[PDB]
């Protein structure tokens, strides 16, 4: 069992994990001890329009008429530093490079918004999601209380987060996981699918590898983790449903601009 | 735009 292969598989996680490490600031540890409250250097909570109100002064503008569009694009462009940090990291995959570029880019174009929910469930607990790098708490019912189409926006994050949060992975199995989502060869209009499959085999080994070491105590993690895929492809494709939403909408879709800057950081 | 972001950090 311990034999060259796995070996290579345990140097292949620890390449992984030391590239998560340098291209990911905002690691999971990191959140999680915001979260269960270990970090004395503490976010304010946001929980209401009262608090928010009394939250602006920790609340930065960084900075369409419609402003649920106006935010997509503050996200989006918010995470550029995101994208470049996930294809810096998918640099460090071996082969991923060698791949046809078009190719490297189509893993990356899908790829980078389903990490950016696998990272941003580390930011979450079932009470709410940090914000403001780690300097605020949005609730998770607060955001959900906004008027539609906004209370809409955050929850199935949220829903997502909690179920994936369950499985109680760190960042050295995050980042196998990463890799395996950017090496995914089933995304639409990659032109040589066996190279990325032959990658994502060998990331998959790794992945399932360090499942077994670092879970003994979770039946099935593996097909658990990778069945998240499926939520993580869900909730990205969710935004284009959200877009009709609000297109369609009539009702007021005005929002604080305290809620709008929030919304900004979150996706 | 993300295609073209991606492009450039591959470089
Ligand atoms: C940004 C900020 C907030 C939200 N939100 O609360 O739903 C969403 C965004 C956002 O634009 N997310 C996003 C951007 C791009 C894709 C994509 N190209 O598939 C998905 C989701």
Same mark, same amino acid.
């Given at each position: ?85 996930? #294809? ?23 790829? /980078?918004?389903?990490?950016?929910? #696998? ?19 949005? #609730? ?39 890799? /395996? ?48 895929? #499926? ?37 | ?11």
């Amino acid at each position: 069992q311990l034999n060259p292969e796995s070996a290579d598989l345990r140097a292949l996680a620890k390449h992984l994990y030391d590239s998560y490490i340098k291209s990911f600031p905002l690691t999971k540890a990191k959140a999680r001890a915001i979260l269960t409250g270990k970090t004395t250097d503490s976010p304010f909570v946001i929980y209401d329009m009262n608090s928010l109100m009394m939250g602006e002064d920790k609340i930065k503008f960084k900075h369409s008429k419609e402003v649920a569009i106006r935010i997509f694009q503050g996200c989006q462009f918010r995470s550029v530093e995101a994208v470049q940090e996930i #294809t810096e990291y998918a640099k460090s995959i071996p082969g991923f490079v060698n791949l046809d570029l078009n190719d490297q880019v189509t893993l990356l174009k899908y790829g /980078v918004h389903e990490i950016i929910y #696998t990272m941003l469930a580390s930011l979450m607990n079932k009470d709410g999601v940090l914000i403001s790098e780690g300097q605020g708490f949005m #609730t998770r019912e607060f955001l959900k209380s906004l008027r539609k189409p906004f209370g809409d926006f955050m929850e199935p994050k949220f829903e997502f987060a909690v179920k994936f949060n369950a499985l109680e992975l760190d960042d050295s199995d995050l980042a196998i996981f990463i890799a /395996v989502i950017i090496l995914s060869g089933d995304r639409p209009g990659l032109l040589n699918v066996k190279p990325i499959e032959d990658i994502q085999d060998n990331l998959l080994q790794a992945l399932e590898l360090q499942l077994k070491l670092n879970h003994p105590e979770s039946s099935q993690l593996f097909a658990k983790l990778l069945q998240k895929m #499926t939520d993580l492809r869900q909730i990205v494709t969710e935004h284009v449903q959200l877009l009709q939403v609000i297109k369609k909408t009539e009702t007021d879709m005005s929002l604080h601009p305290l809620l709008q800057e929030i919304y900004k950081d979150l996706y | 735009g993300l295609e073209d972001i991606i492009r450039k950090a591959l470089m």
